[PDB]
Symmetry: C3
Subunit: 275 residues, 3 copies
């Protein structure tokens, strides 16, 4: 699939057809139109039709869709919508607990699957799931695993438990060679100072971006994701001293060996001019 970084994946429910155009103008790397836990049961059918009309009327629009899982009766109608419009470039599979769930949603949709880890069962099967055919990258339901594991969302201890799940998304991402994963949603819409901290914590940990819920969150996320002038100046000074060809040296009073030089070069290239 696409092995590129998604810095922002903005959720917008299909009950809000007028806010899907707003989502795409946010500047979000991806927009997720939702048909599942933001859409009330009675509106799922009408919400699916709202999305179909949006894709039809907007052929150049390319979106991701969080479908309902196989336990739901609308599953197949959700998969058919993902398969039949070119604007659907992938789907979020919620409540994923098996590689077989990934393969069925992938084959029936013909589109790449972003498995969402939202439960204890998901974590335990995550080897299978990340390695399953059709997987592009992983994302995580932070508020969902707090329910499933009985966490007091927002607390020190809760973030420590979530740190273990994040570790598994990050570990399995490398083992299965997936594209960079996206950390969960920061629900305090207007708290940009808290949002900035959750974004920098995620990047420092190896995540590529964040699942967003508001367009106001897009610029804070993308701005916090770019390397600082310092980090780029460090990477430059580290790359400059490894041109000589020395095996090991010191840059900021810190030893620099091959792996550190490799970190500076990947920073210099992933974000700016390489070489």
């Amino acid at each position: 699939m696409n092995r590129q970084i998604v810095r922002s994946a903005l959720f917008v429910p299909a009950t809000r057809p007028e806010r899907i155009p707003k989502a795409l103008a946010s500047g979000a790397d991806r927009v997720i139109v939702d048909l599942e836990d933001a859409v009330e049961e009675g509106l799922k059918v009408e919400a699916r039709a709202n999305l179909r009309r949006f894709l039809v009327d907007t052929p150049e629009a390319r979106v991701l869709v969080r479908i309902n899982a196989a336990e739901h009766p609308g599953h197949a109608d959700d998969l058919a919508l993902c398969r039949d419009h070119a604007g659907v470039i992938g789907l979020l599979l919620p409540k994923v607990e098996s590689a077989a769930q990934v393969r069925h949603a992938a084959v029936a949709s013909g589109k790449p699957v972003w498995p969402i880890v939202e439960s204890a069962r998901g974590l335990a099967a995550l080897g299978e799931i990340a390695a399953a055919a059709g997987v592009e990258r992983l994302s995580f339901g932070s508020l969902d695993l707090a329910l499933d594991l009985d966490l007091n969302s927002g607390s020190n201890a809760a973030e420590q438990i979530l740190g273990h799940a994040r570790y598994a998304l990050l570990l399995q991402t490398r083992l299965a060679g997936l594209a960079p994963p996206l950390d969960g949603v920061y629900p305090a819409i207007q708290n940009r100072a808290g949002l900035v901290e959750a974004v920098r914590f995620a990047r420092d940990m190896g995540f590529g971006g964040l699942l967003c819920i508001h367009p106001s969150q897009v610029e804070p996320i993308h701005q916090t994701l770019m390397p600082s002038p310092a980090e780029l100046e460090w990477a430059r000074r580290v790359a400059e001293a490894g041109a000589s060809g020395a095996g090991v040296f010191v840059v900021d009073g810190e030893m620099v060996d091959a792996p550190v030089l490799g970190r500076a070069r990947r920073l210099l290239e992933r974000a700016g001019e390489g070489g």
Copy 2:
């Protein structure tokens, strides 16, 4: 077994039978009579006889018993005592390292087993152990595990190791469908401010209660475990706004989706009047 919350399980050694009544009058949700690591080798036979006599003289009493593990020569005598008195409603199995150890303790006692995860070996086999037939809930031997892993008890690094072990107790609890687990003992008897912090950290992470070692600890634990006026006031207001049935709303500047609504309803009902 019982899928109810045990907020506190108060240890009292079987060498001090005049303290068993005091333990029960504490209000601890469970009292554990100890035959293992608080009874010196030389007093274990007499201590068992103290416990046998207390059970006979106190038919309405219901206690949990921590026996010696199968390596011990008194193992079989401990099991018979747990099997032969109705007042014994379960047994703590220390140093558990295999599902076969749980099964032998459950079949021979005919009572529910509380495994204590006290060793690296226990953790590695915790899948087997938590799924063994007879398991009611897991509990955490924090001081045995510091011994086993050469930890400096009380330190930042040690608690970080203990956090990974706690996660496996919490993960397997959900995977095996067990009753809520108990975090380890807080040994600073009179330091209630530290006890309160350890109790709120454990609850926030998904534990149901604490192993305790003094009756003076019980009220701090049950008082720290009840939802605050604010948390209940929060749950009421998120439940209030999701009554109509809308998919996603905002409560405290924070997004409220189905999983958050589910947390507030479980709080309002798990502790208080539901509906």
Copy 3:
């Protein structure tokens, strides 16, 4: 192998053979002569010859060698140097990802193996790796792991991930019964206060020592590893109060049972006179 503690293992590259003697006079418990990530490709053959010349010229010297992994063309020549000189008392195997690589390095060198956990693949196979025949102890490549997992070395988040890696080295050490492992390198050569903190965090967590990269790091590490007067005074008083033979008692306002007594006795003996 040796089930003793290595407090410090001082890296020195085989390109600077004049520094190998300095490494030995450092007092480091072990010296590592490097043929991998500090020796540039173009210098590896000559560096191999530098190490051979040092070993022949210094029959009494006892060193560890960090060889190139099996993917490297010099792999077999490196193992041959380890096998043919008595001064080579073990080898560091970098980029370890399978038990079979351990067995090939062990059998071909005939010397004990220190696997370095430097990658996600390594972590996932760490059960196999630690249990393989030939392993003496595990060590941790913190800077390789930051590259492999895209970590911002030095940040709060990266340290949390590395804690998950560290946990698995420590768990697998206990499960496979290996000698005590060594935490990764602290690269800020002159920041002794930061080094001292990295050393104490590692010890509190169960490491026996640290991989080091400069001889000035050796004395800070060895002084920070020794128990403080306070810690020894604590163990003495808990050991003194448990001499009578009581099962449970109070020492510093803290309950003391069998597991706590064992920590106090192990502290007094592992560092000082036992009994």
